[PDB]
């Protein structure tokens, strides 16, 4: 049977890509800028409405680490969706509990708060950190500070905008939530100075800055940061929404440093890009400050998303996608480096861990969008961040044959752009 | 049927009784909620606990499940789109999101649709839009924008939502708070009119019936008159229909009762027949268009799968005529209770509602409100009060005539059983 969206879509006679673009310009709020109309995905590949194939090298900015339409994940969705999707957490069910137990054991935490979005996991963590700082550190009323890094990105709520240094994220959205102190990323000295304020509740940080440009910090940064935080009884909140779940070659990007975050945020690939589910995890004596009535969410921890998440997380384990991301990521960086550094003098850096990789180009000596369009032409879909940072974030299930082909196609697109300069 | 992954994981854990699940929950789940029941299946207006005991669901996700639990068509739409494509980000186009927005744009009468995931995101997205519009179009000073809200509002749990709440537990120890809010009494035209004197006001943000606040029904004409007042000061009317909208109160939108067409409209909850979180912000072009590229976003907002479900969920509302069904049964429900419970039961302070959004307020000094929750449960009714003393009765709108009759009877019997027991 045709579903309603199918029969409605057919009724509008949307034939070409252009017809869809015009539909979007008319009815969809215009808060995004590429031209392709994707119809179907499977694994690392997607297909547009004309049956043209591409490798998806954005993968939801790491929401589709398991690939598009993973059969196991789709089957767990569909089987749960037939039984039960929503109870509210005002009633028990036979899924939410076991899911939290499953996550708590896999990542080694006492308590799991399930929310829907990455941003909500962020607000949730800032809230828990404030309340814990008022009730356990006994810092004076309303004086709680949270430290974070210039060019952070954890969401789009007004509080998120309030803690951003990125003009377009905050401009004309105030007045702002106070209580933030901004420091440079990857700067051990600045963290230490800012840690002198005894009203600090938390340092909030990404192991690698994602939307900020795949800024990989210097060896030992997170380890040292954790030590300085403990020293002043300050929570380390580590956002692994983009970096977690095998993307960087380990279960969490913090494992590279053997850091166990005091509070852990997961999202995106936690559902294999099927439904929004995020999580905040922490020890009991921190997480337990959230008493009944003091925080909540309608869809948070619904049994449908739980079942998906358990299956999604099991795919990461069973298919060994961590090891895979490490092997392929090193091969990817090695290949691009041999073939492009020196030969392509407008490539400033090729950087990454695992399959969270990027090519920083000099935007005074090329137009970034030419690279993006030549990528598209050669079967590679990608979106840069901050104009000049090309990102390469394929699903981790991309096969060896596929990953070799894509790497070739990528190298070719950069060389072809250089040639054409 | 074959054992699902998730089922074999919990069979592995040897969780058989209701209390095995309560214990698992207490150990591993953040303890930010307060009920004894373990639900494992929903169909329509009914759910079943793990023992096979059957109940009527009279919370329905606080009007997230208007189309019933596990509606066949919605599930079939989920599964068929799920096999094709679930997510692209809005950085690439797809064949679902544009059509879906047109669908909503046409059904509700607006130029532009912003799709988000949660109710709270839609609320925040609205505050962001209003502020930015006030700065760029009304040209008020930077950081001076104000938004007017009502005492006891509930729109979510973000720090900014906390910042604009008057509910102690929602805001306490979660500061410092986002400035920019002016609280006034719900259902007070005088207080609205006065607060609209400040030219820095960007919007009035209001629910047509206060949901979590206690099913507080304003006096006739309140929303009509409010819109006039806002319009005269060039102030946006943002109406939160997340809980009241989509047929729950007898009409497509609760605002339709007052022929109010909100300047910004919020929906969520039943927008997805409770299958997946999807919410929407709808408004005219010259307001919504302040959100330029890169100034707002969300990983999962407007994902193909959720769009597919929402369009199906909305179609179910029309095809099965659930606005009419909510109107008819609702009136009958309020009829039944006021007849049989006023007079006989002194500790009923009021019975109120519109459509199938109803509430029984009890005097919490004359009775323990939990006795009522447990007696309802004993008689096969699952409900959860808001604010201790407001009993809520929010069933799916697909509740049949026999189910509703039986349920109303079981509900009356519970109230009378508690008064009997008082004596
Ligand atoms: C590190 C990080 N945190 C949080 C978020 C927000 O996730 P969402 O878009 O699901 O709100 C994103 C995107 C991200 O890259
Ligand atoms: C009127 C109203 N608005 C907003 C929300 C927030 O919705 P969510 O829990 O989906 O964030 C709720 C709950 C509600 O009842």
B99 touches chain A (CB under 8 A): yes
Which atom of ligand 1 is found nearest the CA of A210? 15
What are residue B390's DSSP bridge partners?
B361, B386
d(CA A310, CA A301): 12
Q: How far is CA A407 from CA A53, A68, A337, A362, A375, in A?
A: 16, 20, 12, 21, 11
- A62, A43, A120, A58: which is closest to A268 by C-alpha? A62
Resolution (A): 2.3
Sole residue written with tokens 């007849």? B339
CB A155 within 8 A of CB A182: no
Residue A240, ligand 1, Cβ within 6 A: no
Q: Which fold has domain A1-69+321-421?
A: 3.90.1150
CA angle A118, A123, A128 (to 5 degrees): 125
Residue environment code for B251-269, b if the CB has 16+ CB neighbours within 10 A, otherwise e: bbbbbbbbebbbbbbbbbb
Which residues on chain B are in Cβ contact (under 8 Å) with A390? Answer: none
Lining residues, ligand 2, CB within 6 Å: A 297-299; B 62, 118-120, 123, 154-156, 207, 211-212, 240, 242-243, 268
CA atoms within 13 A on the CB side of A360: 12
The conformation of residue A29, written as its DSSP 8-state character, comes to -
- Domain locations along chain B: 1-70+322-423, 71-321
Neighbours of B141 (CB within 10 A): 10
Which residues on chain A are in Cβ contact (under 8 Å) with B135? Answer: 172
- Nearest-CA distance from A342 to chain B in Å? 31
CA atoms within 13 A on the CB side of A372: 22
Looking at 3.30.428.10, 3.30.450.40, 3.90.1150.10, 3.50.50.60, the CATH number of the domain B1-70+322-423 comes to 3.90.1150.10
User: Please, what sign has the CA dihedral across residues B28, A267, B2, A395?
Assistant: negative
- Could you tell me the distance, in angstroms and rounded to a whole number, from the CA of residue B239 to the centre of ligand 2? 12
The conformation of residue B163, written as its DSSP 8-state character, comes to H
- E strand residue ranges, B254-394: 264-267, 279-283, 348-354, 357-362, 381-382, 390-393
A131 touches chain B (CB under 8 A): yes
Q: Are strands B112-116 and B279-283 parallel, antiparallel or unpaired?
A: antiparallel
Which residue among B61, B111, B136 sits closest to A172, beta carbon to beta carbon?
B136
Q: Where are the alpha helices (DSSP H) in B296-368?
A: 304-319, 322-341
Q: Are strands B236-240 and B201-206 parallel, antiparallel or unpaired?
A: parallel
Nearest-by-CA chain A residue for B309: A5
- Over its C-alpha atoms, chain B yields an Rg (Å, rounded) of 22
Pick the residue of A31, A89, A285 with the most B CBs within 10 A to test the interface with B by mutation: A31
d(CA B105, CA A29): 11
In what helix (H) or strand (E) does residue B132 lie, and over which residues does it extend?
helix B119-136
Give, for ligand 2, the residue of B119, B253, B271 to mutate: max count of ligand atoms closer than 8 Å to Cβ.
B119
Looking at 3.40.50.11540, 3.40.640.10, 3.30.830.10, 3.30.70.1890, the CATH number of the domain B71-321 comes to 3.40.640.10
Which residues on chain A are in Cβ contact (under 8 Å) with B41? Answer: 83-84
CB contact under 8 A, A31 and B76: no
Give, for ligand 2, the residue of B33, B254, B268 to mutate: max count of ligand atoms closer than 8 Å to Cβ.
B268
Q: Taking CB atoms and an 8 Å cut-off, how many pairs form between chains A and B?
A: 446
Nearest-by-CA chain A residue for B78: A78
How many residues does the structure list for chain A?
A: 421
Looking at 3.90.1150.10, 3.30.110.40, 3.40.190.10, 3.40.640.10, the CATH number of the domain A70-320 comes to 3.40.640.10
CB B330 within 8 A of CB B354: yes
């Amino acid at each position: 049977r045709k579903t309603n969206i199918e029969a409605y879509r057919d009724g509008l006679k949307l034939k070409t890509e252009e017809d869809f673009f015009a539909c979007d310009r008319q009815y969809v709020c215009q808060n995004y800028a590429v031209p392709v109309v994707i119809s179907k995905g499977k694994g690392a590949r997607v297909w547009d409405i004309n049956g043209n194939e591409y490798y998806d090298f954005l993968a939801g900015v790491s929401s589709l680490s398991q690939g598009h339409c993973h059969p196991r994940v789709i089957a767990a969705l569909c089987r749960q969706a037939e039984r039960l999707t929503l109870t509210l957490r005002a009633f028990g069910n036979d899924v939410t509990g076991p899911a939290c137990r499953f996550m708590a054991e896999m990542f080694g935490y006492d308590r799991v708060l399930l929310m829907n979005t990455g941003a909500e996991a962020g607000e949730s963590a800032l809230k828990i950190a404030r309340k814990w700082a008022y009730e356990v550190k006994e810092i004076p009323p309303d004086s709680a500070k949270v430290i974070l890094c210039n060019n952070n990105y954890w969401g789009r709520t007004i509080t998120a905008c309030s803690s951003s240094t990125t003009f377009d994220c905050y401009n004309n959205f105030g007045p702002f939530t106070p209580g933030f102190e901004l420091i440079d990323y990857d700067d051990v000295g600045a963290l230490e100075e800012a840690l002198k304020d005894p009203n600090v509740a938390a340092f909030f940080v990404e192991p690698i800055q994602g939307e900020g440009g795949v800024n990989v910090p210097k060896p030992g940064y997170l380890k040292r940061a954790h030590e300085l935080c403990r020293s002043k009884n300050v929570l380390l909140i580590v956002d692994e929404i983009q970096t977690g779940l095998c993307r960087t070659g380990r279960l969490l990007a913090a494992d590279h440093d053997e850091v166990h975050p005091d509070i852990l945020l997961l999202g995106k690939s936690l559902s294999a890009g099927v439904v929004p589910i995020s999580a905040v995890m922490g020890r009991a004596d921190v997480m337990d400050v959230l008493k009944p009535g003091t925080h909540g969410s309608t869809f948070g921890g619904n049994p449908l998303a739980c079942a998906v998440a358990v299956e999604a997380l099991t795919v990461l384990k069973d298919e060994k996608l961590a090891d895979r991301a490490e092997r392929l990521g090193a091969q990817f960086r090695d290949c691009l480096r041999r073939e492009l550094y020196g030969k392509v003098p407008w490539i400033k850096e090729i950087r990454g861990r695992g399959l969270l990789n990027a090519v920083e180009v000099d935007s005074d000596a090329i137009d970034p969008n030419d690279v993006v369009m030549k990528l598209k032409e050669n079967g590679i879909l990608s979106k840069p961040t901050r104009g000049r940072v090309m990102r390469f974030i394929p699903p981790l299930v991309i096969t060896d044959e596929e990953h070799r082909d894509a790497t070739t196609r990528i190298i070719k697109s950069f060389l072809a752009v250089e040639e054409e300069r």
